[PDB]
């Protein structure tokens, strides 16, 4: 069983979500207990499964939350919280923070078995028209508040035609008193 010459397939490298639930989230309420969370269906974030690469080597998926009003993705303000509890997931994720810039790095298997579902995190809304090391107190907020989950994996290699896909999608538009 190998790949000597079996011309009967049509699925190149591609990391598409297995399930995409509603795309909304009421991120504006959480001051009762101490730090509750907010997560809609499928723990807010949808499911993720990389399929399209039969390489026998583990790659690092580039997953993080960035804002986007047109296309130039940007680093969210404090949207980097995402602790998992209750259910136990064998997903091996990581958190990298370099000054107001957190990201997620999860090494997945391209040709073996590494399906994972992200539904155990939360967002932190504390805008105040002046994010600074002191405290954000004003009322609710007076600035856009959209978000965009970027799902793209890029492997380092010579032939650009190797493994590189982008999947930035997330219709989360905010508004006044919303």
PDB file of C-alpha atoms in Angstrom:
ATOM      1  CA  UNK A   1       0.000   0.000   0.000  1.00  0.00           C
ATOM      2  CA  UNK A   2       1.801   3.162  -1.172  1.00  0.00           C
ATOM      3  CA  UNK A   3       1.634   5.852  -3.882  1.00  0.00           C
ATOM      4  CA  UNK A   4       3.313   4.212  -6.898  1.00  0.00           C
ATOM      5  CA  UNK A   5       0.698   5.665  -9.276  1.00  0.00           C
ATOM      6  CA  UNK A   6      -2.954   5.907  -8.188  1.00  0.00           C
ATOM      7  CA  UNK A   7      -4.592   8.654 -10.264  1.00  0.00           C
ATOM      8  CA  UNK A   8      -7.992   8.710  -8.544  1.00  0.00           C
ATOM      9  CA  UNK A   9      -7.981  11.643  -6.100  1.00  0.00           C
ATOM     10  CA  UNK A  10      -8.590  15.413  -6.126  1.00  0.00           C
ATOM     11  CA  UNK A  11      -7.841  17.002  -2.734  1.00  0.00           C
ATOM     12  CA  UNK A  12      -4.672  19.094  -2.338  1.00  0.00           C
ATOM     13  CA  UNK A  13      -3.564  20.819   0.893  1.00  0.00           C
ATOM     14  CA  UNK A  14      -6.469  22.637   2.597  1.00  0.00           C
ATOM     15  CA  UNK A  15      -7.478  23.309   6.217  1.00  0.00           C
ATOM     16  CA  UNK A  16     -11.265  23.812   6.199  1.00  0.00           C
ATOM     17  CA  UNK A  17     -13.430  23.818   9.346  1.00  0.00           C
ATOM     18  CA  UNK A  18     -15.516  20.631   9.733  1.00  0.00           C
ATOM     19  CA  UNK A  19     -18.487  22.509  11.224  1.00  0.00           C
ATOM     20  CA  UNK A  20     -19.347  26.231  11.203  1.00  0.00           C
ATOM     21  CA  UNK A  21     -22.024  27.197  13.753  1.00  0.00           C
ATOM     22  CA  UNK A  22     -23.716  30.623  13.958  1.00  0.00           C
ATOM     23  CA  UNK A  23     -21.272  33.551  13.801  1.00  0.00           C
ATOM     24  CA  UNK A  24     -22.494  35.755  16.672  1.00  0.00           C
ATOM     25  CA  UNK A  25     -21.390  36.376  20.260  1.00  0.00           C
ATOM     26  CA  UNK A  26     -22.762  38.737  22.927  1.00  0.00           C
ATOM     27  CA  UNK A  27     -19.356  39.909  24.195  1.00  0.00           C
ATOM     28  CA  UNK A  28     -20.736  42.556  26.584  1.00  0.00           C
ATOM     29  CA  UNK A  29     -21.669  41.048  29.915  1.00  0.00           C
ATOM     30  CA  UNK A  30     -19.512  39.394  32.613  1.00  0.00           C
ATOM     31  CA  UNK A  31     -19.162  41.066  36.033  1.00  0.00           C
ATOM     32  CA  UNK A  32     -21.040  38.739  38.402  1.00  0.00           C
ATOM     33  CA  UNK A  33     -18.825  35.818  39.484  1.00  0.00           C
ATOM     34  CA  UNK A  34     -15.218  36.909  38.849  1.00  0.00           C
ATOM     35  CA  UNK A  35     -14.187  36.056  35.268  1.00  0.00           C
ATOM     36  CA  UNK A  36     -16.931  33.957  33.629  1.00  0.00           C
ATOM     37  CA  UNK A  37     -16.677  33.467  29.846  1.00  0.00           C
ATOM     38  CA  UNK A  38     -18.719  33.974  26.747  1.00  0.00           C
ATOM     39  CA  UNK A  39     -18.963  31.238  24.089  1.00  0.00           C
ATOM     40  CA  UNK A  40     -21.854  30.565  21.699  1.00  0.00           C
ATOM     41  CA  UNK A  41     -22.440  27.209  19.953  1.00  0.00           C
ATOM     42  CA  UNK A  42     -19.339  24.997  19.597  1.00  0.00           C
ATOM     43  CA  UNK A  43     -17.725  27.112  22.336  1.00  0.00           C
ATOM     44  CA  UNK A  44     -17.888  30.125  19.990  1.00  0.00           C
ATOM     45  CA  UNK A  45     -14.953  29.079  17.780  1.00  0.00           C
ATOM     46  CA  UNK A  46     -15.896  26.390  15.232  1.00  0.00           C
ATOM     47  CA  UNK A  47     -14.149  23.046  14.716  1.00  0.00           C
ATOM     48  CA  UNK A  48     -10.844  22.756  12.825  1.00  0.00           C
ATOM     49  CA  UNK A  49      -9.402  19.833  10.834  1.00  0.00           C
ATOM     50  CA  UNK A  50      -6.406  20.011   8.467  1.00  0.00           C
ATOM     51  CA  UNK A  51      -6.819  17.780   5.394  1.00  0.00           C
ATOM     52  CA  UNK A  52      -4.888  17.884   2.109  1.00  0.00           C
ATOM     53  CA  UNK A  53      -1.295  17.019   3.098  1.00  0.00           C
ATOM     54  CA  UNK A  54      -0.080  13.400   3.295  1.00  0.00           C
ATOM     55  CA  UNK A  55       3.378  14.367   4.615  1.00  0.00           C
ATOM     56  CA  UNK A  56       4.826  12.179   7.398  1.00  0.00           C
ATOM     57  CA  UNK A  57       5.905  15.286   9.350  1.00  0.00           C
ATOM     58  CA  UNK A  58       4.086  17.407  11.949  1.00  0.00           C
ATOM     59  CA  UNK A  59       3.471  21.055  10.979  1.00  0.00           C
ATOM     60  CA  UNK A  60       2.478  24.022  13.152  1.00  0.00           C
ATOM     61  CA  UNK A  61      -0.943  25.507  12.326  1.00  0.00           C
ATOM     62  CA  UNK A  62      -1.112  29.316  12.628  1.00  0.00           C
ATOM     63  CA  UNK A  63      -4.286  30.060  14.617  1.00  0.00           C
ATOM     64  CA  UNK A  64      -5.007  33.376  16.382  1.00  0.00           C
ATOM     65  CA  UNK A  65      -7.780  35.988  16.771  1.00  0.00           C
ATOM     66  CA  UNK A  66      -7.272  39.248  14.839  1.00  0.00           C
ATOM     67  CA  UNK A  67      -9.617  42.144  14.023  1.00  0.00           C
ATOM     68  CA  UNK A  68     -10.354  43.028  10.382  1.00  0.00           C
ATOM     69  CA  UNK A  69     -12.649  45.721   8.936  1.00  0.00           C
ATOM     70  CA  UNK A  70     -11.501  45.256   5.320  1.00  0.00           C
ATOM     71  CA  UNK A  71      -8.643  42.738   4.971  1.00  0.00           C
ATOM     72  CA  UNK A  72      -5.528  44.004   6.794  1.00  0.00           C
ATOM     73  CA  UNK A  73      -5.829  41.659   9.790  1.00  0.00           C
ATOM     74  CA  UNK A  74      -4.656  43.220  13.078  1.00  0.00           C
ATOM     75  CA  UNK A  75      -3.775  42.106  16.620  1.00  0.00           C
ATOM     76  CA  UNK A  76      -6.874  42.216  18.854  1.00  0.00           C
ATOM     77  CA  UNK A  77      -6.689  44.389  21.992  1.00  0.00           C
ATOM     78  CA  UNK A  78      -7.017  41.819  24.802  1.00  0.00           C
ATOM     79  CA  UNK A  79      -8.830  39.014  22.939  1.00  0.00           C
ATOM     80  CA  UNK A  80      -6.319  36.281  23.851  1.00  0.00           C
ATOM     81  CA  UNK A  81      -7.985  34.370  26.715  1.00  0.00           C
ATOM     82  CA  UNK A  82      -8.896  30.770  25.970  1.00  0.00           C
ATOM     83  CA  UNK A  83      -8.557  28.347  28.895  1.00  0.00           C
ATOM     84  CA  UNK A  84     -10.089  24.891  28.362  1.00  0.00           C
ATOM     85  CA  UNK A  85     -11.857  23.046  31.192  1.00  0.00           C
ATOM     86  CA  UNK A  86     -15.016  20.968  31.735  1.00  0.00           C
ATOM     87  CA  UNK A  87     -14.480  18.651  28.747  1.00  0.00           C
ATOM     88  CA  UNK A  88     -10.950  17.266  28.264  1.00  0.00           C
ATOM     89  CA  UNK A  89      -9.518  17.781  24.760  1.00  0.00           C
ATOM     90  CA  UNK A  90      -6.256  16.149  23.608  1.00  0.00           C
ATOM     91  CA  UNK A  91      -5.581  19.190  21.392  1.00  0.00           C
ATOM     92  CA  UNK A  92      -1.981  20.367  21.928  1.00  0.00           C
ATOM     93  CA  UNK A  93      -2.232  24.169  21.605  1.00  0.00           C
ATOM     94  CA  UNK A  94       0.191  26.896  22.735  1.00  0.00           C
ATOM     95  CA  UNK A  95       0.043  30.615  23.596  1.00  0.00           C
ATOM     96  CA  UNK A  96       2.700  33.124  22.472  1.00  0.00           C
ATOM     97  CA  UNK A  97       2.509  36.715  23.766  1.00  0.00           C
ATOM     98  CA  UNK A  98       4.937  39.485  22.731  1.00  0.00           C
ATOM     99  CA  UNK A  99       3.499  42.651  24.319  1.00  0.00           C
ATOM    100  CA  UNK A 100      -0.232  43.181  23.648  1.00  0.00           C
ATOM    101  CA  UNK A 101      -0.006  40.392  21.046  1.00  0.00           C
ATOM    102  CA  UNK A 102      -1.083  36.835  21.934  1.00  0.00           C
ATOM    103  CA  UNK A 103      -1.311  34.037  19.340  1.00  0.00           C
ATOM    104  CA  UNK A 104      -2.098  30.305  19.173  1.00  0.00           C
ATOM    105  CA  UNK A 105       0.381  27.707  17.865  1.00  0.00           C
ATOM    106  CA  UNK A 106      -0.932  24.127  17.620  1.00  0.00           C
ATOM    107  CA  UNK A 107       1.224  21.459  15.920  1.00  0.00           C
ATOM    108  CA  UNK A 108      -1.085  19.097  14.007  1.00  0.00           C
ATOM    109  CA  UNK A 109      -0.472  15.890  12.026  1.00  0.00           C
ATOM    110  CA  UNK A 110      -0.919  16.175   8.226  1.00  0.00           C
ATOM    111  CA  UNK A 111      -1.071  12.414   7.510  1.00  0.00           C
ATOM    112  CA  UNK A 112      -1.978  10.434  10.651  1.00  0.00           C
ATOM    113  CA  UNK A 113      -4.783  11.789  12.868  1.00  0.00           C
ATOM    114  CA  UNK A 114      -5.138  15.165  14.615  1.00  0.00           C
ATOM    115  CA  UNK A 115      -8.767  16.357  14.486  1.00  0.00           C
ATOM    116  CA  UNK A 116      -9.413  19.067  17.101  1.00  0.00           C
ATOM    117  CA  UNK A 117     -12.370  21.236  18.149  1.00  0.00           C
ATOM    118  CA  UNK A 118     -11.941  24.703  19.688  1.00  0.00           C
ATOM    119  CA  UNK A 119     -14.899  25.433  21.993  1.00  0.00           C
ATOM    120  CA  UNK A 120     -13.420  26.276  25.418  1.00  0.00           C
ATOM    121  CA  UNK A 121     -12.245  29.913  25.391  1.00  0.00           C
ATOM    122  CA  UNK A 122     -13.615  33.421  26.003  1.00  0.00           C
ATOM    123  CA  UNK A 123     -13.102  37.047  24.928  1.00  0.00           C
ATOM    124  CA  UNK A 124     -12.168  40.031  27.130  1.00  0.00           C
ATOM    125  CA  UNK A 125     -13.899  43.337  26.317  1.00  0.00           C
ATOM    126  CA  UNK A 126     -12.299  46.235  28.223  1.00  0.00           C
ATOM    127  CA  UNK A 127     -11.856  48.910  25.531  1.00  0.00           C
ATOM    128  CA  UNK A 128     -11.956  52.527  26.759  1.00  0.00           C
ATOM    129  CA  UNK A 129     -10.778  54.765  23.894  1.00  0.00           C
ATOM    130  CA  UNK A 130      -7.274  54.574  25.405  1.00  0.00           C
ATOM    131  CA  UNK A 131      -5.866  51.117  26.218  1.00  0.00           C
ATOM    132  CA  UNK A 132      -3.063  51.729  28.745  1.00  0.00           C
ATOM    133  CA  UNK A 133      -1.486  50.007  31.770  1.00  0.00           C
ATOM    134  CA  UNK A 134      -3.857  51.475  34.386  1.00  0.00           C
ATOM    135  CA  UNK A 135      -7.564  50.653  33.939  1.00  0.00           C
ATOM    136  CA  UNK A 136     -10.354  51.041  31.354  1.00  0.00           C
ATOM    137  CA  UNK A 137     -13.333  52.817  32.957  1.00  0.00           C
ATOM    138  CA  UNK A 138     -15.779  54.868  30.855  1.00  0.00           C
ATOM    139  CA  UNK A 139     -19.157  53.128  30.439  1.00  0.00           C
ATOM    140  CA  UNK A 140     -19.396  50.591  27.590  1.00  0.00           C
ATOM    141  CA  UNK A 141     -17.179  51.671  24.670  1.00  0.00           C
ATOM    142  CA  UNK A 142     -17.284  54.004  21.644  1.00  0.00           C
ATOM    143  CA  UNK A 143     -15.385  52.244  18.832  1.00  0.00           C
ATOM    144  CA  UNK A 144     -15.917  49.408  16.323  1.00  0.00           C
ATOM    145  CA  UNK A 145     -15.510  45.902  17.781  1.00  0.00           C
ATOM    146  CA  UNK A 146     -15.334  43.365  14.936  1.00  0.00           C
ATOM    147  CA  UNK A 147     -13.198  40.197  15.003  1.00  0.00           C
ATOM    148  CA  UNK A 148     -11.799  37.721  12.448  1.00  0.00           C
ATOM    149  CA  UNK A 149     -10.338  34.263  13.150  1.00  0.00           C
ATOM    150  CA  UNK A 150      -7.442  33.598  10.754  1.00  0.00           C
ATOM    151  CA  UNK A 151      -6.874  29.915   9.903  1.00  0.00           C
ATOM    152  CA  UNK A 152      -3.814  29.508   7.650  1.00  0.00           C
ATOM    153  CA  UNK A 153      -0.921  27.016   7.706  1.00  0.00           C
ATOM    154  CA  UNK A 154       2.382  27.901   6.027  1.00  0.00           C
ATOM    155  CA  UNK A 155       5.227  25.366   5.852  1.00  0.00           C
ATOM    156  CA  UNK A 156       8.816  26.463   5.129  1.00  0.00           C
ATOM    157  CA  UNK A 157      10.081  24.912   1.874  1.00  0.00           C
ATOM    158  CA  UNK A 158      11.740  25.675  -1.476  1.00  0.00           C
ATOM    159  CA  UNK A 159       8.955  25.007  -4.010  1.00  0.00           C
ATOM    160  CA  UNK A 160       6.302  27.579  -3.025  1.00  0.00           C
ATOM    161  CA  UNK A 161       3.830  24.951  -4.238  1.00  0.00           C
ATOM    162  CA  UNK A 162       4.026  22.839  -1.076  1.00  0.00           C
ATOM    163  CA  UNK A 163       1.664  23.628   1.833  1.00  0.00           C
ATOM    164  CA  UNK A 164       0.173  27.098   2.331  1.00  0.00           C
ATOM    165  CA  UNK A 165      -3.535  27.955   2.726  1.00  0.00           C
ATOM    166  CA  UNK A 166      -5.403  30.891   4.308  1.00  0.00           C
ATOM    167  CA  UNK A 167      -8.887  30.800   5.873  1.00  0.00           C
ATOM    168  CA  UNK A 168      -9.786  34.125   7.531  1.00  0.00           C
ATOM    169  CA  UNK A 169     -13.565  34.235   8.092  1.00  0.00           C
ATOM    170  CA  UNK A 170     -15.760  35.581  10.918  1.00  0.00           C
ATOM    171  CA  UNK A 171     -18.776  37.866  10.423  1.00  0.00           C
ATOM    172  CA  UNK A 172     -18.739  39.404  13.928  1.00  0.00           C
ATOM    173  CA  UNK A 173     -19.674  43.080  13.451  1.00  0.00           C
ATOM    174  CA  UNK A 174     -20.386  45.124  16.600  1.00  0.00           C
ATOM    175  CA  UNK A 175     -22.236  48.442  17.034  1.00  0.00           C
ATOM    176  CA  UNK A 176     -23.404  51.028  19.595  1.00  0.00           C
ATOM    177  CA  UNK A 177     -24.880  49.433  22.749  1.00  0.00           C
ATOM    178  CA  UNK A 178     -24.021  46.124  21.042  1.00  0.00           C
TER     179      UNK A 178
END
